[PDB]
Amino acid sequence: IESGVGRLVDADMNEESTRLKALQTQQQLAIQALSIANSDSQNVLSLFR
Amino acid sequence: IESGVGRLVDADMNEESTRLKALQTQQQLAIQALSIANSDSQNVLSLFR
């Protein structure tokens, strides 16, 4: 019964580690893209000066 | 919804800057033309010395 509970409930931690690394990389990319998207709106100031 | 509101309400600032420059130039030309028109009037004084 304990073995059945384990196979039904436990998680193979290797793919969770892979997902953790992948989400860290995705978050880094998202922060970089968000910074670029925030910064790019300042280009309009050139015309008015 | 907010993006739709922005699409319906926002204005592209490049076109507004172009219009602002055009209207400033048109105002300058109109003022010059008005000055020329005002200066046109007093030329008649030469006939009556």
B14 and A48 within 8 Å at the Cβ level: the answer is no
Give the method of determination.
Answer: cryo-EM
C-alpha of A25 from chain center? 6
From CA B49, how far away is CA B47, in angstroms rounded?
6
Closest CA to B6 of A41, A48, A49, A47: A41
Instruction: Give phi and psi for A33, each to the nearest 5.
Output: -65, -40
From CA B34, how far away is CA B49, in angstroms rounded?
26
Tell me the residues of A at the B interface, defined by beta carbons under 8 Å apart: 44, 47-48
Closest CA to B24 of B10, B32, B35, B13: B32
CB-CB neighbors (< 8 A) of A44 in chain B? 13-14
From CA B16, how far away is CA A40, in angstroms rounded?
19
Residue at token pair 């109109």? B30
Q: How far is CA A1 from CA A10, A12, A13, A43, B43, in A?
A: 14, 19, 22, 65, 115
CB-CB neighbors (< 8 A) of B17 in chain A? 47-48
From CA B10, how far away is CA B19, in angstroms rounded?
16
Residue of A nearest to B20 (CA): A48
